[PDB]
Amino acid sequence: MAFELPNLPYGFRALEPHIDQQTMEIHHDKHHNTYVTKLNAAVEGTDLESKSIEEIVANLDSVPENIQTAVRNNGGGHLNHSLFWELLTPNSEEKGTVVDKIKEQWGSLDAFKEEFANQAAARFGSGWAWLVVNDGKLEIVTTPNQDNPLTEGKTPILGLDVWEHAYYLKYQNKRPDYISAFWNVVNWEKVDELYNAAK
Amino acid sequence: MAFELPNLPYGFRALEPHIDQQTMEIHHDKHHNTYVTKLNAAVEGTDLESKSIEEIVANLDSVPENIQTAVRNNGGGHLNHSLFWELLTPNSEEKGTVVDKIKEQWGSLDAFKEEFANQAAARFGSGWAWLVVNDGKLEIVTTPNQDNPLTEGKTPILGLDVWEHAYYLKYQNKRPDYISAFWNVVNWEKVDELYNAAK
Ligand SMILES: [Mn+2]
Ligand SMILES: [Mn+2]
Known about the structure:
mainly alpha, binds manganese (II) ion, Superoxide dismutase (chains A, B), Mn/Fe_SOD_BS (chains A, B), superoxide dismutase activity (chains A, B), homodimer
């Protein structure tokens, strides 16, 4: 069926001890796969079936009424996880075009991490924390559920899943320890690629 | 500080093998306790501090603007978990005034379980599934995050936490297996008590 579940760029253990193998397997093979399944079921036989997931999520207001929510939720899930897997790496190095821009705007990388971590922690319920480019400038935003900033005309360049499935097996309630661990596995080359592509 | 974390009516292992000890401990000692902490911080020095949690949640529109969300979220968390612990038991028996009413209205207890389970499963993101009394009649509804039907003038008589923290350690993504397990630990005497109190 139309959309497909992308492979991880790395093995399921790749991100230990920051994110456990069991979570990487369930999160990818089960959670992300379910979004794909339900997205395909929603769009089957529609003009949407053949669009890129980015163009669908960017333009949710153009979706037929009877599948607006299914597409928002499962289309968003598909997009958000596809970005997430590419944004993680076992060989992270905190350097590059966006890291240099973060240091210029926030003053240091720690000051950016603090704001991101605290916005991430403050997202009540399920959702995501993002670094976005909005009209050429960097901003930190959060979204509920599987909503994505593309829908509001902001390009995501880094995202962190703060649904409890993303962290509960290893960290339980300690979302801030998960958030802290995430910095060790950020693919800043991917961030810089997404930043360069931004419209 | 004003509101207090209620004790469980039973021990932390009480609900095994349907809900694991580790989840009961974290869920109560950490998640629920945090709602109490943050609720107290929001209401400290306000006229709200001395109200019952029910009257606060029932009347969220009367909360001062600058703490509306903190009270909705943490007040709701406090109420919802306080109800939840009382609604579980190691000695459940599917009988009573509400079970007889469920069989009359749905036709069987399985038909009610099906609807409840599927509404519970369909609640996207974090939230709760409820059996409520609305103007004397039973209805199944779900709410996001820590919202509670009392706010909309419906009295909850059974609730199931479908935040992933409630089920992830034992069931991971298999929310429906958690939902199915929950039936074994429902305190229908408490349900009948809440039903009898309803205004
Ligand atoms: Mn996720
Ligand atoms: Mn909970």
